[model samples]
Target: HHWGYGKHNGPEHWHKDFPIAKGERQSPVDIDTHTAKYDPSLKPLSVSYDQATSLRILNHGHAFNVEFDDSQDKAVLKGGPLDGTYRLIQFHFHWGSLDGQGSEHTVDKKKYAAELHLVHWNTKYGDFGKAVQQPDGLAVLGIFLKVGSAKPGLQKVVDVLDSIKTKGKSADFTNFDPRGLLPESLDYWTYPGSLTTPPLLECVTWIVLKEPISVSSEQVLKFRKLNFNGEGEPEELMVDNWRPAQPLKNRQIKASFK
Candidate 1:
């Protein structure tokens, strides 16, 4: 009755339940810089956020997500391979049980400690649920995470991990600007891909940043502390919540920087 990243129900076995698992445009593909073409026409990404729109943070079994209020488009992402404004809905992360083995999208075949996904929905398609079924309906900004200095901005989220330590738990979180979590460089690779999770819809326009954000080893370890089970349920450690890189098929990765 439950789907997860465990060996019995992991990425390799997802196709048994979700037929789209083997879709041609699947996500988290390896971004081979050598084959990626640079495009001068790609516009600079425009990211605007309102701290007040941050609602709460939750343990979604698979990962911890910080939900946002997308009712009025206060926080929207535009430009950079996007047509109209895309409203920010939520953001989450995927990490490994150990160091240097987590990120979904690898760069030149190198995996990082973790990866963050800022999920957005196209305003033209109405809501996230409906948008996810259409092409150009969703845009996810992927930022890789490396183990190094502690990220001050992330501490706000990490501090509340104890409150939502179990599945289905959540705590009120606000006044947080997701932008502060980004790296200095916005240079990235863009490609069409599907969601890394189940019901893997091929509706995402992935914008993977070239640079990785820093997080202390201690902070990275804290994420693994959250459990996939709620109270009264058998405990299951939440780690390695990432999908393996899928085949590139015939898609070409476009780059915003040379």
Candidate 2:
């Protein structure tokens, strides 16, 4: 009934339901690395995940999200342009239908195989419900994914896709450590942006990483096995669940490294 990645309710049509889609700081902007000024003041990002905090994985119609417990900041992200402690709430992926064009945020006009977004909410705002409404309330860590030889990082997640292949389905995804999936280099580019979905709140401090991890074609195929449609609805493959790069406007992207 709302928005989706299909043409009928896709990114271009989002402005109808979420007028802010055409607002000042929309997300998934193309990263022009050459022009990004290195900001030495940016601190190194830190994160500590509590495997116990991982609760479940659900296919939220478009993307698969692994929700975590934010009750006590067990999994926290701080530093690197963030003012205070931000609790990791959920993490999800956006992938392309084809191997050549999956990622949301691009590097020098190059699209990767996929993109990972680890969302956190500012604890200063008390809770996610309240934080999401503030301009400095959210911090989303973005990581790119390229196609390569087999990588074991996301196997814990890929193995469970079979259980939650359709929309509205969820499965137990406990004791999973997502920290191991990050790349060796944490150098990043930061910017002010909004959620890439409907009700696209302009609250996120986007920190997109400079490095990307790789996964084999087989593993990527497992992601395509998902369906946006529920059991009763006509099955639609969940592919290209990504918003294209939005306008940069007057925004200046800051780099953590020169």
Candidate 3:
């Protein structure tokens, strides 16, 4: 028997399941066109982070939104990565509302506990928002998180999870190195796809990292405890907030070292 957003007994139960039927169209399948001809110039630029960078936090009710102001910073793309300096814009996450499992991207149908997304835009395209509307305008860096060893890079953001536990609740966190969360490997799988969320705009160049950061079982529990129940309420729990992984369609999954 399938549960959640799968085959039967899933989100399709709107009319018979809810008073107001959610008439949203289903996300479509994607087709890949990347060939074996690899371009060394399509890599990401090397970037460094520090405390002076302006960090803004926007409370999206479900997850904490963090953004870094890198408009003036020109990250040098070594090894002829892509074609230009892509400015880092914002960072966010996807998780389950109930815990145990909740993430959009899956490996062989296995969903992770949570996933983090770092959004960027090619300077050649002006800005991230504008680029997000173009087919080749956006670059999203993704990292998978699982319960295990505590990750040093996650300390900064996880520390603030308590401050924004409730739905619609938000807080600002500053002076942190967002790059610390990135895996040391420059290797990645690139593909053309749309946002996993609604509007499902197909304008993203996805760079999925192979390495996963480990968090302790206790740390995973902390995310499960968050809720819009109230501000600073310990009992308000947040669980399974993940979306089902979208179809890869005919997209080519390219890896750096592959």
Give RMSD to native, each candidate.
1.0, 1.0, 6.2
| Candidate 3 Cα errors over 4 Å, as ranges | 1-45, 48-54, 74-81, 97-100, 228-237
Global Cα lDDT for candidate 2: 0.91
State model 1's lDDT. Answer: 0.92
Candidate 2 on 1-258: residue-level lDDT in tens? 878988798899989888899999999899999989999899999877754388999988979999998889698998999999999999999998999998999989999999999999999989999998999999999999999977787899999999999988999999888887789999999999999887799999999999999999999999998999987888899999999999999999999998
In candidate 2, what residue range of length 10 has the lowest lDDT sum? 45-54
246 Cα displacement, candidate 2 (Å): 0.6
How well is each residue in 147-167 modelled by candidate 1, as lDDT tens digits? 999999999888899999998
TM-score of 1: 0.98
Candidate 2, TM-score vs. the true structure?
A: 0.98
Model 1 bad stretches (over 4 Å): 50-52
Tens-digit lDDT track of model 3 for 1-258: 222333354444423544222223222222132443344555543554443253666555445578677666633222223455566677777666444566666654566778888776777777666887677666677778776787777766777777776656666666767767766666655666766554456776676666767777766766666663555545534565455545454555665644
* Model 3 worst lDDT window (10 residues): 22-31
The backbone clash count of each candidate, in order, is: 0, 1, 27
